[PDB]
Symmetry: C4
């Protein structure tokens, strides 16, 4: 009967489970996590390396930021001491091409006008807008240095980042694997007094490769100067398996690889017919979209993965191998996006067992009610969220004052979780203003943390304590 029907497809759920797992398990062995950090903090948490404390992760001063140029990543991304040309990485990994420096810039004399201080100020700079977007050829002129290029002139898109979240390319440079002039560039950038005053965001980005497990990784770096005059740096990192081709073990992963694409293809159409079979039948059912969420999810990876990847990998052999540098980013961006959703699927992919693990017993029948009576969870979720946002908002306004954790308003929505959990650096909140707001801190941790608790749990308890009688009303 159905025990033949479902377990058969359940077998498909069983085996194909390991398949994508095998891919993830195969494409990524456990050590890949190390391969991030071990390959990271050789740059990030490495100091400025003057025999001075501060790292990249803490940078402040403008000119200090060239002490990042000279003495951090420059000598960070390295040339090796062994003794035609042949350049590896710390004897392990593999460099390719050479980074592509980007930046931003805006029209001078744009905005920020004091009316009567025009004495003191001849010109000013406002924030980086959708209208900022302005292109200064003005020298000192060596070639590129002043050359604007649109980001359609370049190939990939821009970067997202926290505050902006924009697209544009102010200037550009392709770096030099030669350690000689890559500093003399900067020295010629002294000759240019470099590229920045009111510069918002500086991009120096590239990507590289380990030889051993052949895996590939991207270096995307973000240094924001918000228009108020500050310096906020950050990072971006993604690993990559560049070609699904493996010179050795591909046909182990390529074994099941071209297999599943028609496997799920069977899953594709079968419920599509069930869409017009059941239209409102899955409305209000709440067992519906989740099952078919994967459908959208799956194809997204499926469709555009090989579509983009198998395309450009070719020239990646060529535009790379010459000292010139191929942009892999936008491609990688997809891999990221790929990696992202593919994982996000894995959950729902995984939890496909969650419905499968229990057909067994009263156990299986009771969780049906669990969320079915959890409808209330949605009811007072809001009053929390508001009151949650409330303090957060209030926090924003109140604590827009000096404090971290706060007042990039989104982050205040997290730091409003982070507290009820813990870890808070509280010496700052109080020392903001000795009345203000620590009462807040008291209020919230009083109110929320006392009001929030059981309004979960009772509704968890009651109907569940009700499911006992409600499982007693079958007996």
């Amino acid at each position: 009967k159905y025990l033949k029907s479902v377990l058969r497809e359940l077998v498909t759920y069983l085996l194909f489970l390991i398949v994508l797992c095998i891919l993830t398990y195969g494409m990524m062995s456990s050590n890949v996590y190390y391969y991030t950090r071990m390959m990271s903090q050789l740059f990030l948490d490495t100091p400025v390396s003057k025999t001075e404390k501060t790292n990249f992760k803490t940078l402040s001063s403008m000119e200090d930021f060239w002490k990042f140029t000279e003495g951090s990543l420059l000598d960070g991304l390295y040339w090796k001491m062994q003794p035609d040309n042949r350049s590896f990485i710390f004897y392990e990994n593999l460099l390719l091409g050479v980074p592509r420096i980007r930046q931003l810039r805006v029209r001078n004399g744009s905005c920020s006008i004091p009316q009567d201080l025009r004495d003191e100020i001849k010109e000013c700079y406002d924030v980086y807008s959708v209208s900022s977007e302005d292109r200064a050829p003005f020298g000192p002129r060596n070639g590129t240095a002043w050359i604007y290029t649109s980001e359609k002139d370049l190939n990939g898109s821009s970067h997202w980042g926290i505050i902006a979240t924009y697209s544009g390319a102010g200037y550009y440079l392709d770096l030099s694997r030669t350690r000689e002039e890559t500093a003399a560039q900067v020295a010629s950038l002294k000759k240019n007094v470099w590229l920045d005053r009111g510069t918002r965001a500086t991009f120096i980005d590239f990507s590289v490769y380990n030889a051993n497990i052949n895996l590939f990784c991207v270096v995307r770096l973000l240094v924001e100067f918000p228009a108020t005059g500050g310096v906020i740096p950050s990072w971006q990192f993604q690993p990559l398996k560049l070609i699904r081709y493996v010179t050795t073990f591909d046909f182990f992963l390529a074994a099941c690889e071209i297999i599943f694409c028609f496997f799920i293809f069977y899953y594709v159409v079968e419920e599509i017919l069930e869409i017009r079979i059941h239209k409102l039948h899955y409305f209000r059912s709440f067992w519906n979209c989740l099952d078919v969420v994967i459908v959208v999810l799956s194809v997204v990876a499926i469709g555009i993965n090989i579509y983009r990847t198998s395309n450009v990998e070719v020239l990646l052999q060529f535009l790379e191998d010459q000292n010139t540098f191929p942009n892999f980013e936008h491609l990688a961006y997809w891999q990221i996006q790929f990696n992202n959703i593919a994982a996000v699927t894995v959950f729902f992919v995984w939890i496909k067992l969650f419905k499968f693990i229990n057909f067994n017993r009263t156990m299986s029948q009771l969780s049906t009610t669990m969320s079915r009576c959890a409808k209330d969870l949605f009811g007072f979720a809001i009053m929390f969220f508001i009151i949650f946002l409330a303090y957060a908002q209030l926090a924003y306004l109140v604590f827009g004052t000096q404090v971290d954790d706060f007042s990039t308003f989104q982050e205040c929505i997290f730091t409003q979780f982070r507290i009820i959990l813990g870890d808070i650096n509280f010496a700052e909140i109080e020392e903001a203003n000795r009345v203000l707001g620590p009462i807040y801190f008291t209020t919230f941790v009083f109110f929320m943390f006392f009001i929030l608790l059981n309004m979960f749990l009772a509704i968890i308890n009651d109907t569940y304590s009700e499911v006992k009688s409600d499982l007693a009303q079958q007996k």
Copy 2:
């Protein structure tokens, strides 16, 4: 019907919601938070800058505190290297005037008398009292240096601060934008061996301005020496939009600005008639004051905002522009106070939706009981508070011993929350006395943290679990 009546005013609640939001959203864009810290820790967490560790945030020794004078904020507040006079702020923001140094002092030979140690002690100094308040012209005399001035002789009020919380001006100085003698002052203050021995509180305060978003900010600094001989420093920071006038975007914010003042003006009178309509009708109703709390709240900003601000902004053009320095503080103090309450309103302003969001369903009817049966929350709140204060008190007495987090008795009321939440630095509590009090720590975290839990939650649970039957008794 009422669906026309309320939603119409609800529309007013809807739109006017965004209005004050727009102001806050408009007067403060998100980055203003950075504009605090990015502009702060260039002073606070910056070291003493001798190539020595300690910052301002950690200061201890008396003479070290002049290593704050020379090598911290002095060179902190800066003169720029570009090449008549033209001085900008790190190329971004804008200085104005020059700081006004203040201080305190007390009569010598006042109090602190050992009877038989008068051998060892000729004179002494007690705490800073309401009677301390005493004025030493005694030299070395250059002009101001010994000149007392009352704080009515000066313009603004004093500062609050933690332990004192007083008003007075011991001496005064207007600083120099010239970096030359601003040290030679201190050098002439070496010639005066400066101003301090038993000095309680040293004020060096001022305020400045960003050019870009035109926003304005105040620098209020507090260094307390409590009479026991110690050194406790701190800070005070508030941002400002100085003139509601904007040379560019004012009429965007001035669009709705003069609009709402008569908008809420409609709200003003309408319930005032409802006060004599319903007198005791809102007594015991508990739906009453909160609705009309805003009323007091609103006008406070409303009335005195433009009242004080629009006044003095004029001379702020003049007394500023000469090398002499206008006090903006007391004004700013209001802005703070302004900023403070205006935010505090926003909550209740915000939560005005909290009653509005739910007219919908049984959801709306059940929260009525939520606090209505929460009356018990007030009942055993006290026994906690006492027992809370109890340990805290006990903590005060017990841990008046060396420890932080404790024994400025108010702060012990927080550190009595901070623990049950977490983060405690516990190596100190035990190491106070190996019996004493870690049993306490055990007791509390045992007792409270076991006794406190459900005495919330049951009362949360029960009556709520009772609201089910109590929502079942409508069905």
Copy 3:
């Protein structure tokens, strides 16, 4: 009626409440907490002061510990630069006498015998026992340096401390306010190669005084070398009001001071008659001992406070004023003990209102049951405590391995609270042994932290949820 009877004594409870408060409030103003730390970390967290990192709070090496002698507390306890003799404390507080160095030592060749390694080892040293207690006159002989003295030969007792917890005086020295030879002592202690090899505990202790608020404080320092060869340092600090006499404000505190001693004296006898009136009547009543706990508590302070204090304060004028040093310690030890219990009373003193605050309403009647039905709290308290001790024990055994927070078995009973609360430094537990024990960590935080929760709260809930019906059965 009784409303005249109780409130009258309640008035006594009301007023006399503030009395002892006033004492504590009067004897200790809030700033006294600072007066600890501000006066402390000028020694503790101050580095070794070579321009080297480590402080006293972190000391390790034997010889490094003389870098504590020379360059920490020696120059810490200071002589002032102002210009017969006249020496103040940083211009504020007041030194008295000069510290009394103590130490320990044990018989050589006592124990620790490898049988076949007697080749390698001629002599050894075991732990510090009740039988260790052995007295080496052997030189190099200058006078005291080798002179044992019993602690009855000296005046006060010994110190408790963590591992030992013993009494004895190995050697002694009275220090020198002269900063000259106090180092040359140590230099003559180089001439003696100092006093230590297998030395267990080194005591350098003294006490001093602030002039301003006249308050007094004790410096008791502990450096343990456990016999395994390690170095564990620590501190001891207590503040003091030395004479209840105040040269100025005494008669404010001496106002109510001689008042209360006969006040409570009224409380003394009145229930003593009630002891033979009610013998078993207070048995099983559980309202009994707590009320009369204070009785023991009160007199303890009462009796021995002035008994010891008023005695020795006399010679404290004399044995102090000569360059020789009076031991105040044992006296202070009582003050500590005094301070300790007097505070401990204050709780029960305080909570005397806890019964008083509620005679009011059903509120007052329901908490009667609260602990009355809390009898169960004692029932499964044990199973926890065992299982608590269980893991702790298991922790001890398991984690007797390198780790802090653990395996001084008492401390493992705290670190078994500390986790369920939080803050754990967990990188150590796992990295102990990669199986061992992090499963433990999992188990406990699973088991306890899931099993412990509601077994409190249900028993809190149920009977309380039962008190509703049990308060419904009066209605």
Copy 4:
């Protein structure tokens, strides 16, 4: 009756309780914990000792790792300054033999093949496999330096460790108590340019001894280079009582020692007969295995303790006393294993009272149901575990990106507890990708931390709240 029967054996449970305790109490006094750390961080958290920050616990660079050779443990394990040869360890403990350096290595040109980059790469190295295991005699040849030995050629086994978890000995060296050439070895290892390029794991291990309490301890050190090119170091530490023989107090511990071996021997057989008496009788009983778990547990220590130990201790006198070094490790490995389980028993040993403590009252009868109705705990434990693993898995995949605490998949199962408890370093999770995944963080701490709570507690509550009526149905 049985009160004579059980309490008699309960007496045996009572007394024999202290016996093994006495052993543990006797074999290990409390201070042994210190004897770990006090003897540890003289190596671990000691810096590289160049007057540079980083310790062993933080090592990164390859060549830096010889700054561990030269300037850390080399001079760490020390030769003493007192004035034939006579070498202590800080006048306290005792060295023996001299460490045995080990390492690993793999075939060159094995794997890691880029197909078209064979231009850039002549040879490569893949991970350390079960097939890696390859033996390079290639020079520069001095004797051992290139000599492979199997681990059966050596005596003990290999080490477990985190990622590998393997067995093999690449090369070997016996160190020198002479501090002269032990560096010149390394200098001759400069002459050999040492032993490493693609080296996975470097073992330098040994064990030593305190003279005082005669206790013994093992030094097992692990430095992994995973094949991606990174550097992860670590430690291993176990204390030891080497011979149960004590030159002094043995016959105190040897008093009860040969006593219990026949004591439990009585316990051995008595239930063995009860196995065939009751076969399925203990099936489903759930009171069964736990009681007899100790049985397996006990003998494991019992059997192999003296079996291995009493054997090799002999030659430990000899192969030690010559400058050559006996391997004690494998022996110690058992001690560890011994120490481990013996402790693990102690729990169940301890909790033997847990059944014994309560025969008393209704208290004793109610906990019977506690787990008896806890059967549900197993029911939704899974849905958690999955959903637990789910996010963890998702975490792995998502956060295989740079982060700690994560993506050695096992560790993500802990860091999935660690959060709900607390302490998280959260600045990394968000800053991974600003969308990705902090929503996750939100989700989990929302979902789990709200969904997990009462699904414990209700099931704890309900049936317990049911045990009241279920204890009311006896009355």
